[PDB]
């Protein structure tokens, strides 16, 4: 006659930064309970070891199962081997990235629902080699080889757990209008969009293979998620 | 009648260990310069930022010019992210292959010679998803990519310069000796073949494409470096 469902739970790393903030509007509209471990914003300091990260992830939900572990951390900084600033740069955004992906994997792997879903982020120019992006790029790659590699042994994921990485071209976020405001925008992707996606896969459904790198494809202002 | 030479100088990463030594050794009986800035051992502390390796790389060589930047450095962990201690072996080898090899791009684009080479150590077991080795399929994986993202732009390496990654199989060494010590070695690469590899490429010669990743494939004894 009444049957009592359960709240399920994401853990949201990165949602101080555009995509995190559409992220977590999604998940509050589809009613999820949100652990955002970086919040009450910068909580968690940057310069936290990937084993005080796995620390301060596995704190933020303790005597919980989380359906979701999302990644959408990371900024974006330019630079080759040619500037002094690219040393900084690359440990940052290995930081944000990198660091917090192989944290974020172990909590999935110790803390995760069965057909839970962890979602990682990369980056469609990743694919490539970036000689004018070596820490972005690097990281990026890195996320992706990352994901793969999680999903290659399913043995220590829950049960019919997935492993995604999104790979974004273009996203239409302030930071993009502001520093090229007269470009077209039809292949800049919006938020809403990517954040809709993710609250889908992690509801259950339209999910590609474990280990998936997938792309985000707009043109003419219409987005398709590939593999 | 007479013509004056100049000394070669190469900047030697990752001396201490098993390749590192053997590699210090090929130079020296090439006579070259060695400026080994990782000894005199443990000279530059592993927690250090990129910031500050390419600082105690840039100070280490002050007043040469490097015709050859080697990193050998790196050490090996298991583990799955199952494994809480993932986080802490994976932070090491970011630290010792990824952290060294940028800061070594840095003081080899400024400081370095004129048909100068650039020699980072990847791992042919990288090239696919690495499940039981998280950390170290990561950390090879971003130094393959760092390796064809430094070489697709000339213009900020010295004339003529060459990048390349090194991805060994298998090395003969003390550890892998007492690891597996009822085992066939007739695909162990010998690790003075490797170091004469690497002197011979510093002295210029037999150089692959930049931005080569080089396996070394050992059979029956015999090793060669293969594109």
Same mark, same amino acid.
């Given at each position: 006659?009444?049957?009592?469902?359960?709240? %399920?739970?994401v853990?949201?790393?990165?949602?101080?930064?555009?995509?995190?903030?559409?992220?977590?509007?999604?998940? *509050? %509209?589809g %009613?999820?309970?949100?652990?955002?471990?970086?919040?009450?914003?910068?909580?968690?300091?940057?310069? $936290?070891?990937?084993?005080?990260?796995?620390?301060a992830? %596995?704190?933020?939900?303790?005597?919980? #199962? =989380?359906?979701? =572990?999302?990644?959408v951390?990371?900024?974006?900084?330019?630079?080759?081997?040619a500037?002094?600033? /690219?040393?900084? $740069?690359?440990?940052?955004m290995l930081?944000?990235?990198?660091?917090?992906?192989?944290?974020?994997? @172990?909590?999935?792997?110790?803390q995760?629902?069965k057909?839970?879903?962890?979602?990682? /982020?990369?980056?469609?120019?990743?694919? +490539?080699?970036?000689?004018?992006?070596?820490?972005?790029?690097?990281? #990026? +790659?890195?996320? @992706?080889?990352?994901?793969? $590699?999680?999903?290659?042994?399913?043995?220590?994921?829950?049960?019919?757990?997935?492993?995604?990485?999104?790979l974004?071209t273009?996203?239409?976020?302030?930071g993009?209008r502001?520093?090229m405001?007269?470009a077209?925008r039809?292949?800049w992707?919006?938020?809403?969009? =990517? *954040?809709?996606?993710?609250?889908?896969?992690?509801?259950? $459904?339209?999910?590609?293979?474990?280990?998936?790198?997938?792309?985000?494809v707009?043109?003419?202002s219409?987005?398709?998620f590939? =593999?």
């Amino acid at each position: 006659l009444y049957f009592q469902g359960h709240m %399920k739970n994401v853990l949201l790393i990165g949602a101080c930064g555009a995509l995190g903030r559409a992220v977590a509007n999604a998940f *509050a %509209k589809g %009613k999820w309970s949100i652990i955002s471990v970086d919040q009450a914003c910068g909580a968690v300091n940057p310069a $936290s070891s990937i084993e005080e990260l796995q620390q301060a992830y %596995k704190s933020a939900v303790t005597g919980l #199962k =989380v359906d979701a =572990v999302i990644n959408v951390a990371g900024g974006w900084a330019g630079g080759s081997v040619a500037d002094a600033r /690219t040393a900084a $740069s690359t440990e940052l955004m290995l930081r944000q990235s990198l660091f917090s992906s192989v944290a974020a994997a @172990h909590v999935f792997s110790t803390q995760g629902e069965k057909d839970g879903l962890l979602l990682l /982020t990369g980056a469609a120019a990743a694919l +490539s080699p970036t000689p004018g992006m070596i820490g972005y790029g690097t990281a #990026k +790659s890195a996320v @992706h080889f990352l994901c793969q $590699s999680i999903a290659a042994d399913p043995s220590v994921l829950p049960t019919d757990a997935s492993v995604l990485a999104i790979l974004p071209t273009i996203l239409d976020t302030p930071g993009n209008r502001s520093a090229m405001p007269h470009a077209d925008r039809s292949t800049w992707t919006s938020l809403e969009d =990517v *954040a809709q996606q993710i609250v889908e896969w992690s509801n259950g $459904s339209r999910r590609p293979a474990s280990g998936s790198l997938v792309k985000i494809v707009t043109e003419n202002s219409k987005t398709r998620f590939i =593999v």
